[PDB]
Every structure is written in C-alpha cells, then in structure tokens.
C-alpha cells in the first residue's frame, strides 16, 4: 500500500478522539494496518470513539495495572487477529500521572504511593506490554511507545517528566529483550499536544501556574522547533510513530524519535 | 582547612566500611566537615562501622521509605547539630533495587512492587531527602547524590538503571526546589565500585551470567577510562562527592558530575 | 508508489558501489524518486558506477570544496530537473579526513590543514550543499547527512570523529535555515559500513593497530546493538535516509536518527 | 593552602581584566597556584592586565595558530618555571570566530577560511596546547577549556557553538592521550560571561538582531539557572575550573562541567 501495509498493529492508549493513539491508529489504518487496540477502563466510550476509524477494529480491555489483563493479553489479541497470525506492530501510548505528581502541587508534596502508580502505569507498563506482546510478535516486527523529552526539567509535568525518564530508560532494556525476537523497541518524544487532559492543564485544572507553565512550554516549543509545532495536530506525530512501525527505520532500537519539530535540537 | 572546613553535611548511605558513603563521610571528615550521618535498619552495625571515621558523628535512624521517619528528620539533625545550626550539605548514597528487578532474573520478570520498591529507595527518596532536608540547609549549601549513567542500558543492573534514569530524572527537580533555598543538587555518576554487595554479584549472588556480565562491565571501564578505573578505590569517588559539596563547584546544579575515569566519555 | 514517489532528491557522495549513498540512491529510485547524483572527481568512474542504479539519474560535478560548483549548483540541478522543478530531497554523504587526521598517525600529529580540510568536506559542506541548495527546495523537503556518532571518542576515527561532532553541530543550525523554506534537515548517524574506504582501514591501510581498533568497534557493535548490526549491509541505512526523505517523519528536524542497530542505546 | 597550593598552572586566554582566563588566574592565585600565563599578540597590554592579579607570573608569548609558538611553549614554560619542574595545569581559556560566523551574518555566509580560522583557535588549539604541554605534566596533572554547551543551535553564535561542538569532541580526544600521562582534560561550559566582547555584541557591535538575540539568551540562562546566573560574575566559572585544576575531581575526564547555574538541566 500503504507504509503499513498488511502489518497487524495493537495500538494502546485511545481515550478520546483527540488521543496522540488515536490518531496512530488513523494513520496506521490509512497506511494498510490492521489494529487491534487496547482501551483501558471505559471501553464502550472506546468502542465508539474508535468506531470513527478509518476501519474496524477489535477493541480489547487492558489495564496496564492488570496483571491478569497481561496474562491474557495476547491469547485474547491472536483470537482477535486469528491463530495462524502475528504482530507486526505495538504501540504504547499509555500515561498517567495522579495529579499530586503533576500540579502546582509542589514536587516535594507528591506520595510516593501516586508516583509509583504514574510510573507503573507511563513507564513499567512499557516492559509489561513488550512482555505480553513479544511472544506474539513478527520478527521485523515494531513496539513504539510515546514519550517526551525529560532530559531537562521543565515546570508543570513533574513526576510525570520523572515517568518519562523511567520510560526512555526502559525503552532500552525492552530493546534487548526485543531484539531477541527481531522486533526494535522505540519511543517518539512528541512535542505538546492539545489532547483533553492537556487542554484541561492549560485551561487551569491543575491550577493556574501549571496552566500558564504548560502554555509557555508551548509557545517556547513552537518558536524553538525549526519548521515550527502546531500543539493542535497529532498527526506528524502519528505519523513519526508509523515510520517506527513500517520498515524504514530497520536499524534503529532502544531509541527515541523526536517528533517534535526540532525544538530539542534548539536552545532559543 | 579542609576543603569542607566547618560544614554541617548528613551523608546517608553507610552500610559497610566498603560502603562509597563511609568513604565520602571520611574524606568529607579529614576535609573539616562535621558529619551527621543517617542509616537504615542496622543502626548498631552502623554505628560500629562509623567508629571508624576520623571524627564522631552522630548517627540518625533514616528509613528513606518512612515516612516518620522523614518527617521527624531534620528536627533529629537540628537537635544532633545544635538549634541554632543548619545543614551545608546532604548526600544521598542510597540504593536498592530487589534482586527480580537485578538478576539473570530477566527484566520482564520483576514484578512492579519490586522496581516500585526500588525506585522508591534508589530515586524517590532523593525528593524525599530534600524535602525533609531542604528547611534545614543553608544559602550555598550543596544536595548530593550517587549515581551511575544510565544513558544506555547495559547488562545485569536492569530495573537499576531505569531508577538511576529516574533518579537523574528526579535530581534536575529537586534542583529547582534546592535554587530557592540557594542550595545545589548533583549527582555523582561513579563507575562500579567492589562494594560488598557488588563483589557478591560479581561472585555469583545473582546468578553466574549476572555475575560475568558486571565483570565484563568492570573491565571494560578501566579499558575505557581514559585514566583508568579500579573498582576497588571508591576514594576519587568520595573526592568528587566532596568537591560538589565545597564551594568550588558553585554553578553547577541539576547536574552530573561523572567520577568514573572518563569511560563515559568514551566509546571504546 | 513508492515512499519516495515523485520526489526529486539530490545525492551526493556516491564513489563507488559500496557507497552508502549508492545504496541511498537505489533504494531511493526503487521507492519512487527521481534523482540527481552530484559526485566529486572522478565523474566518469561515478557515471560508470551510477549506470547500475535502477533508473537514470543526471549526474552533476560537485567538489565540495570548490565555491564555483556551490555557486552554480543550483543552477546546474535546475537545469537536470526542469526550471518549472524543485528538489524535495538533499542526501550528503560526503566525508573525508586526511589520513593524518585518521591513523595510528597520533591524534596530536593530524596538522591543522589536514583537520581543515576534513571538516571542509565533513562538516561545512553540509551547510554549503544546504545554503546552494535550499533556494531550489520544495516546501515539505528534507535534507539528510551521513552522520556517526561522535558523542564518545573511539579508537582510529580520530579527527573524522572530531568532524562529525561539527557536522552534528552544522545539522541543528542548518535545520534553523531549512525550517524557513519547510524544509527538514536532520543526520542518519549509521554504525560502521564497510565500504571500500572502511575495508582498506580494517585490511591496514592506515596501519596495523588503526586496523584492530575498527575491527573491535564493529565486532563491539553488533555486540551491543539489540538488533545487531551487519557491517557489510548499508541498507538499512539507505532505508533510514530514504525515512527521513520521506514525509514520514514530518515533525523531525535539526536532529540525528541512529541507524546503528540501537547500539548506541546501550554499554555493552 | 588553598585548593591548589604549589600547583604549577598554565593559564592562557588573558586579553582584558574581564576575560574568564583573568578570574580563573586570579582565583587560582588565591588558591595557592605558580601560574604561568601565555597572552595571544598584544604581551604589554596583557602583562599590564595581569599586573594586577595576585602574585607575579611569567607571561609567554601563545598564538596557538602559530606552529613556532607552539614549538617553543613547553621549553619556554619549563625556563618560567625552573629545569626541575613540571605543569600540574593547563588551562585552555582561548576562542575566536571571525564576525562572519557569527553576526546577523546569516550563518550560510561565513566562508570556510574564517569558520577554520575560529575552530584552529577555538578548537583545534586544545589539542595543539596539550601536544606542547602534556610533555612537561606531572601525573595528577589536569588541562581544562572553556567550553559552552553546543548541544543545541542557538541564535548569534552560529560557527562559534560548531567550535565548540568540536572543542568538545577534541576534549575526548586529548583525554585519551592526557591519560597516558596521568593527566586529566575536561571542559568547562559556562553560561554567558559579560566580557568585553560579549557587551560590545550585546551592545549591538555584530548588528542588533544579534545584540537582542544574546540578551535574550542571557535573560533566559537566569531564568533557567535553579541557581541563578549572574553574567557580570566569572568567578563561579574561575573557580570551577580550579576545581577541575585541583585533585578534588580525580576521576573525571574528557569531560564537560557546567558552571552555568544549572540552566542546561532545565527546558524552562
Ligand atoms: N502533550 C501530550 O499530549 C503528550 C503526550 N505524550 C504521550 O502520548 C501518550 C498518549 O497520551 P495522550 O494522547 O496525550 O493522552 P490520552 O489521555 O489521550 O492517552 C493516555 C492514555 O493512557 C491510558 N491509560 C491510563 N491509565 C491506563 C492504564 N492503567 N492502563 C491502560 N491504559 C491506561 C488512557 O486510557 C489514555 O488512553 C502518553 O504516553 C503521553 O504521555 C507524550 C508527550 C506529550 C507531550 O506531553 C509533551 C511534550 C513536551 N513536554 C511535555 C509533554
Ligand atoms: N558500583 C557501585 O557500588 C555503585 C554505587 N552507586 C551508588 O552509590 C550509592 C551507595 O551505594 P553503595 O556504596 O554501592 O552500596 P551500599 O550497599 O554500601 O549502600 C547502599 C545504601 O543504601 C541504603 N539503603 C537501602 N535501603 C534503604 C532505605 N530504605 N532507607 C535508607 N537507606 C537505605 C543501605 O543501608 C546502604 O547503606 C547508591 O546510590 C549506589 O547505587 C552508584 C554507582 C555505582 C556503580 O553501580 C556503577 C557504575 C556503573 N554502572 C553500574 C554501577
Ligand atoms: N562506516 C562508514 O562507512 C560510515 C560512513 N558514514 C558516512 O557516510 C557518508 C558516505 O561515506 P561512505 O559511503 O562510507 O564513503 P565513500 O568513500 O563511499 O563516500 C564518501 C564520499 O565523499 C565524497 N567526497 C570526498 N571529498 C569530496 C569533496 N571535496 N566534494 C564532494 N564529495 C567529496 C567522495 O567522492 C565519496 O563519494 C560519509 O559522511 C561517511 O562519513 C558515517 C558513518 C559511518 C560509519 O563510519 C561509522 C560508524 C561508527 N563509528 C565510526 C564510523
Ligand atoms: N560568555 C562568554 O564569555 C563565554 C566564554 N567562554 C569561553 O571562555 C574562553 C575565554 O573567553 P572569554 O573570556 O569570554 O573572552 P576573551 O576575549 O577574554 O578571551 C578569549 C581569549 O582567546 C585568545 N585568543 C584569540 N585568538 C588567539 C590565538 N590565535 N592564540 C592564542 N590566544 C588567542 C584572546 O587573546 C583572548 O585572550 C573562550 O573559550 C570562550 O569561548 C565559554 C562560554 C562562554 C559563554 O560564551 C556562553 C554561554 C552560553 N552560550 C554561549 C556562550
């Protein structure tokens, strides 16, 4: 086709139409993909997001704090794809922070207890799912998580930074046990999407220093990138996402695509 | 004097007098500095194998998971070192990671209690730490914490390595937090050091593939160094600990200080 | 087609069937692009060389170093593409290092003219090739250079390395004058290829240790790449060009995409 | 003494009582350093300047682009400090781009002679300064640049971060060869020092949009620094560079401090 074309790719993370995984999913699906997605805990609410896709799907629950949802997992997605068949594809795009590890609420003040859930959920589940997907991964095959770039601190995102830190760290690991399969493991670093949540943040959920750090994040972000970063589309990053998972990037693992539009390449 | 000449600084982390924290506290000592030092579970053990020091300190119970512990830390220094005294300096030499998140034990096969633990040990508690400390430290004063590069992954230190990448993570936060107190935090990435429980994995505690790889590890670094690395001297270690705690490092925070002979630097 | 379809890219560097940008061209003409070869002294050689391709290509001279190809380049590409016709894609795969700059010949030993020269062609001419040709290019386009990594320094490479860390440093600033024409540029850092150049160094052409350091980088590379990595197969490079190339990485820019086999990602 | 007491240090790059080479000769004096100094082609003003430091040191004539200078330096040294002696550091405080690589001179169009000419300076220059003095270094010895961060592009600097980029990459290479003689070498990066020619740009002498860019690069490094970054004070970076100079980072090699209050660990 069709970059994808003919890859079978699970695709985590949709929550609502403005999903970063989401718009993978879209794209895959234009390019020839054939998905199975995840959906965490709402899955009705995925069911007809998802429903908006160029094609069908197979939507299946998985919580990523779920030991038995990664037990299952795999058995449940070759019924999904049919016995014979294998992924070619996976994508994390899970994340989540409690909002303690994420405010103006200060640094200092988030319980251990919700940072260990964000890193559960934003970084261990990385290795979680290339645990339950590898066994049913295609040599040549692709994991692609999201992240962003936590090599600087930056206000607002905290734990969640922290989180992302964890996540490029296992990223790599999960390399080495991907790579005995034949399968790279990588991570695009995408610059800041208005998704809900992060609308949300900026329109002062988490409080008006965090909303107004968050959109100067922003406005930096997209001075900073060269060719410039419109926070309202996805889809360069969608698309960064499926040339991780075509084969044009054959030699690339442990690694980290920034789709970002250069600004981390940038000072001022 | 005395590099550190009259400074109040807390060193966590002695557990053996091969521990790189009863280095950093003697050198510290024969560099001026007045230590207090903390301690987890074997206070008795500690304070015998701190008799040792060139100096008395008083030693303080610090389980960096308790958070009693952490909230009447710091109260207990004030008290150790006098009502009208605060800290210059606090170093962080703590770290544990369960041997699932460690072994041969594959790296899918840690359960997240167990890297949870970890992190909580080996990066949370640098927050932890701060915050408990930061109250009680002086303008100029110097947060410090060991390290080693997580940049790549690397074979047998597994969930470490992503709680190291957390905890450099971590470290760039609490830099922010430690500016407004006019205090510096850093980290020392060392290269491996025949600490007891180092020299127990290279014998063969964790498995003998774990083992071998670690010894492979350590070759390689001296190889890599430019000046060199012997793994059984964890004073150039205590040396650099001690030079970010002096003033003469006093632009450098959020940072990485590499105390490992230069092998980072250097590809092969 | 063709992910590559219908876009008119300029390669330079092709020398002989060996070189990575033979395999750029190749596998940039089986994906649909039109192309324009540059080439640098021996034009008759590359003609020849060139003729094996998949398709024609018009072939252009480009020494790098001299202002008058750079001046009248442009014109020259205009000309074999159509005056209505911009280019879409630039490759640089130019390098060279006089030998001094490479040996055993002592690090110390490399004259500065012989530096010069290297990062003449390495490294300034990436700028160059962009500033003579970024007025002919498409909105969209993308320039490529062939990088490798120069983060660490490593045995033989020497002063090339040197040229690398420059031509990286060249990239993130020529990305800030592509970006005002929606233009791309970014670097394929590859791990070693044993090109015609590279099995003259390994087979001792630069003396007898410069042969065994390079013989241990590239066995030390697939070692350490998850994936591993066949030096003998350029390939996966040209693929990871044609990537970039593309506009399957639309939101990447000023940056160095490893085609390694994630060796870098990892120590050992 | 004193940090560096009867520490025989080189420091060349003194021009005015502004230059960070001035600090860092005054600092090392207060800290007990014999200081040799080199001075590049207008010796009576800069033995004028240096007057004015702490104690007397013998100023040798260094145009580090001059073959003979470097020749020379080193016999020259040990007659400034006696036949029995040796260097214990060498500090590198030596930088030049011709204006054209770094003006509102769009980056494009600095020719290859000037951008050569500042990397010979800026870059190069390291490594000829340790070729001349590694010779006369005692084990324990250590040579340190001056650096700044290059890792990102940024406005103004333009061919002066290339410098840089390959400064830094020249710092791992004499490293390697600095080892072999007990010596370390490490770069500092500083953040924006007022120095005179750093206010004459800020002042509008490379074009105003090149004095703006620059003062908005300064207002941001503050803004960043967790610390702080004061521009009109040297001394945190003098005194980091004696840190580098003592023997308090020992095992820290071809390397990069930050002197920089922390502002590259920090997005915003
Ligand atoms: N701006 C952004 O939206 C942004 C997003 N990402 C990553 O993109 C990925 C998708 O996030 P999104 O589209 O923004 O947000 P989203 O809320 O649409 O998706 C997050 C998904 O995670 C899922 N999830 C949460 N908990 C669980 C669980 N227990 N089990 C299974 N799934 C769960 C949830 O259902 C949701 O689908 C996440 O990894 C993000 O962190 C990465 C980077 C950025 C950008 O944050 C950025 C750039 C620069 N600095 C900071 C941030
Ligand atoms: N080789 C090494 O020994 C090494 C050690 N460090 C760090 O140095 C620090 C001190 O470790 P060490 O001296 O090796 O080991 P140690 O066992 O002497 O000290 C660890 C300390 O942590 C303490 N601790 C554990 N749990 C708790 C708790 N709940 N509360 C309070 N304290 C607790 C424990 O009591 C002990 O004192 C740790 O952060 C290490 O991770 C950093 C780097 C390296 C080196 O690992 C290295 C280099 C290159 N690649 C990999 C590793
Ligand atoms: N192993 C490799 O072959 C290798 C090659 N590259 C880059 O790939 C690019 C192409 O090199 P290649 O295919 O190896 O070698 P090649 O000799 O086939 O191509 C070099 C080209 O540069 C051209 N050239 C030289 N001087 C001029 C000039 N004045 N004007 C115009 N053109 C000129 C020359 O005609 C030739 O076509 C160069 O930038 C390389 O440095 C990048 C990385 C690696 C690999 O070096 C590597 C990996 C890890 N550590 C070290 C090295
Ligand atoms: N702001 C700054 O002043 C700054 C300065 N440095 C480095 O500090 C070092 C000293 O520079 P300075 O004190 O700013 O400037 P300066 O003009 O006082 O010193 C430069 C010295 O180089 C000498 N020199 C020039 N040509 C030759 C030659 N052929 N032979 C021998 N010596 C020669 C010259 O005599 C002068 O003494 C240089 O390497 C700088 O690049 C490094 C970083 C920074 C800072 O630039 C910075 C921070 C963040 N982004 C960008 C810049």
Same mark, same amino acid.
């Given at each position: ?10 695709? =985590? ?5 403005? =999903?970063? &995984? ?43 704090? /779920? ?23 996976? *994508? ?12 103006? /609420? ?9 940072? =260990?859930?964000?890193? +559960?959920? !934003?970084?261990?589940? #990385?290795? !979680? ?8 991964? /295609? ?22 930074? *922290? ?35 992060? !609308? ?11 909303? &107004? ?44 695509? #920034?789709?970002?539009?250069?600004? +981390?390449?940038?000072?001022?």
């Amino acid at each position: 086709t069709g970059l994808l074309d003919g890859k079978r790719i699970l695709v =985590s993370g949709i929550i609502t139409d403005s =999903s970063i &995984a989401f718009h993978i999913a879209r794209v895959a699906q234009e390019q020839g993909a054939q998905l199975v997605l995840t959906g965490f805990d709402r899955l009705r609410l995925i069911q007809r997001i998802t429903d908006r896709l160029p094609a069908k799907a197979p939507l299946l629950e998985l919580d990523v704090q /779920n030991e038995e949802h990664l037990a299952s997992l795999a058995g449940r997605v070759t019924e999904a794809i049919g016995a014979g068949n294998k992924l070619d594809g996976v *994508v994390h795009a899970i994340g989540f922070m409690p909002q303690t590890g994420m405010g103006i /609420n200060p640094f200092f003040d988030a319980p251990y207890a919700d940072v =260990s859930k964000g890193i +559960h959920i !934003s970084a261990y589940s #990385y290795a !979680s799912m290339a645990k339950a997907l590898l066994p049913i991964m /295609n040599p040549g095959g692709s994991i692609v998580g999201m992240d962003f770039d936590p090599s600087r601190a930056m206000p607002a995102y905290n734990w969640m930074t *922290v989180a992302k830190s964890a996540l490029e760290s296992v990223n790599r690991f999960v390399a080495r046990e991907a790579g005995k399969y034949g399968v790279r493991s990588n991570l695009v670093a995408a610059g800041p999407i208005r998704t809900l949540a992060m !609308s949300a943040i900026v329109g002062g959920a988490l409080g008006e220093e965090a909303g &107004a750090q968050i959109q100067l994040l922003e406005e930096g972000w997209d001075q900073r990138a060269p060719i410039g970063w419109n926070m309202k589309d996805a889809t360069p990053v969608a698309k960064t996402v499926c040339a991780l998972l075509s084969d044009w990037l054959p030699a690339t693992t442990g690694d980290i695509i #920034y789709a970002d539009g250069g600004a +981390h390449t940038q000072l001022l």
